[PDB]
Write a protein that binds this ligand. Structure first.
Ligand SMILES: O=C(CCCC[C@@H]1SC[C@@H]2NC(=O)N[C@@H]21)NCCCN(CCc1ccccn1)CCc1ccccn1
Ligand SMILES: O=C(CCCC[C@@H]1SC[C@@H]2NC(=O)N[C@@H]21)NCCCN(CCc1ccccn1)CCc1ccccn1
Ligand SMILES: O=C(CCCC[C@@H]1SC[C@@H]2NC(=O)N[C@@H]21)NCCCN(CCc1ccccn1)CCc1ccccn1
Ligand SMILES: O=C(CCCC[C@@H]1SC[C@@H]2NC(=O)N[C@@H]21)NCCCN(CCc1ccccn1)CCc1ccccn1
Ligand SMILES: [Cu+2]
Ligand SMILES: [Cu+2]
Ligand SMILES: [Cu+2]
Ligand SMILES: [Cu+2]
Ligand SMILES: [Cu+2]
Ligand SMILES: [Cu+2]
Ligand SMILES: [Cu+2]
Ligand SMILES: [Cu+2]
Ligand SMILES: [Cu+2]
Ligand SMILES: [Cu+2]
Ligand SMILES: [Cu+2]
Ligand SMILES: [Cu+2]
Lengths: 125, 125, 125, 125
């Protein structure tokens, strides 16, 4: 089993009120759904990612990342977000991320194609 | 089938000489391997991602993203990179990305946990 | 005078314990010193930036940015950070930023030259 | 004088056709104007920044950064861009940057306040 397979698997919430439901596999896989509280989004979207299944034991966090393409049966916002970050275990477990949201654009608009931000996920709220 | 399922599936190379081997599924899935020409990496790593399987038809690119956790049977660099970008079809097909590489860190080093950069992938070289 | 010239001018502290001392000019100038609580830094460094001296009146924040080159009379870490963000006035005034720290590198190391993060500055602590 | 004071001072052009006019001071100051070929911009905008006036001599680039607030006598786009990067001297001198563009937003829109991209500046074109 991955060191934090148990710690990562479950439901997570970020500061925007979005919901991140993920299953961590023993091999390093992340699978689940994402529901955004903001933007051109409704209901759940497929996500997939990877995490370090054998992290350092020196108190470092666990690196991970995942992607959502913002197309589902209800909407298509022609964009994708990737979250890159680390899982920090303990009493107040957290997944601390920065993210890149890229929209499909024409080449003349490519310079404004990508948003960057940061989301913190907790097990509560 | 996804509009660019055929266009995305295959082998891609970036400006660093890294090799991105991907299969685009009809549902929006990305699966494959990544081989980095630089950094604490050797041989192939598992990747997974998502792409917009029904992009706009107005000449916009196709949004996509994917993740590599830098653990395989040879090495574990306790880090993960996510690439967020868009596929641009045509004679000179390109995948234009920006990426976030997060290392597992202690909390005292979390401020220096994340690199950002940009990779351009072409079908040749 | 700039709408938030008075609001921005003064001493600010971020979540790392760093100290941001700035004077906002009527023309949009930012001048001051930065003292980082972390990294290859000691004492104060010169900073300069710009802010929107006539922001929207619809409740939006005030865009601003500034740069520190990490050379002073004590140390030279051959790097520069730029903070890009917005000032949010009111009872709990905040400057919410994301930043890019670029080190001078050889071309072979340019892919790992740039860190990205996010700092929140408050008037207290 | 700053090692690359002479190398940096002058007119630079990026891949979008924007024009970056800068004077590097002996102390590490950057002063000049920026004219963007794209976006909500017309004519020249004030910029200010900092650079490492005593870079490493091992072939590394010279770290630097600068800010433009997008207000001038013609327009106010209530936003600011910071470019963070390094100057690389030689026959084909380059300033390689990544940038963060933050718009003033309401707090409910703060999650989509910041664009990220990358500009390469050359002495010609
Ligand atoms: O909303 C979406 C999908 C939802 C994205 C939710 C984000 S993921 C990061 C964050 N953490 C989270 O939990 N939730 C948010 N994808 C298109 C994102 C278009 N813009 C903003 C929204 C919008 C809605 C309607 C019309 C226009 N926009 C991006 C802003 C932009 C940038 C550049 C040029 C033009 N517009
Ligand atoms: O190399 C790795 C895995 C390979 C990553 C390859 C990158 S993905 C983006 C890009 N596109 C590509 O095709 N290839 C590169 N993961 C740890 C990344 C540690 N640092 C740099 C390398 C290193 C090797 C040995 C010892 C120390 N570092 C990141 C730099 C850093 C940042 C903050 C604090 C300390 N160090
Ligand atoms: O510390 C500095 C200057 C201090 C920077 C402080 C940052 S500004 C953003 C943030 N908000 C804040 O208030 N404070 C921090 N500039 C070189 C930054 C080298 N690395 C990390 C530190 C270090 C100290 C000694 C030896 C090696 N590093 C960056 C990590 C890295 C990235 C890629 C390859 C290798 N290393
Ligand atoms: O254009 C500007 C100022 C010009 C900025 C030029 C950029 S600096 C980085 C790059 N290198 C360069 O040489 N040139 C470009 N500042 C507002 C930037 C609003 N959006 C895009 C333009 C626009 C024009 C009219 C109406 C709406 N937008 C940013 C996209 C966005 C993001 C999030 C939510 C909504 N919109
Ligand atoms: Cu180890
Ligand atoms: Cu968009
Ligand atoms: Cu806009
Ligand atoms: Cu559509
Ligand atoms: Cu690292
Ligand atoms: Cu370092
Ligand atoms: Cu206005
Ligand atoms: Cu560095
Ligand atoms: Cu490293
Ligand atoms: Cu030195
Ligand atoms: Cu904007
Ligand atoms: Cu939008």
């Amino acid at each position: 089993m991955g060191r934090d397979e148990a710690g990562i698997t479950g439901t997570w919430y970020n500061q925007l009120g979005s919901t991140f439901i993920v299953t961590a596999g023993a091999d390093g896989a992340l699978t689940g759904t994402y529901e955004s509280a903001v933007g051109n989004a409704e209901s759940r979207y497929v996500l997939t990612g990877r995490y370090d299944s054998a992290p350092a034991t020196d108190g470092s966090g666990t690196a991970l990342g995942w992607t959502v393409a913002w197309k589902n049966n209800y909407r298509n916002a022609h964009s994708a977000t990737t979250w890159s970050g680390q899982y920090v275990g303990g009493a107040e477990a957290r997944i601390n991320t920065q993210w890149l949201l890229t929209c499909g654009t024409t080449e003349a608009n490519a310079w404004k194609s990508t948003l960057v931000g940061h989301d913190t996920f907790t097990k509560v709220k």
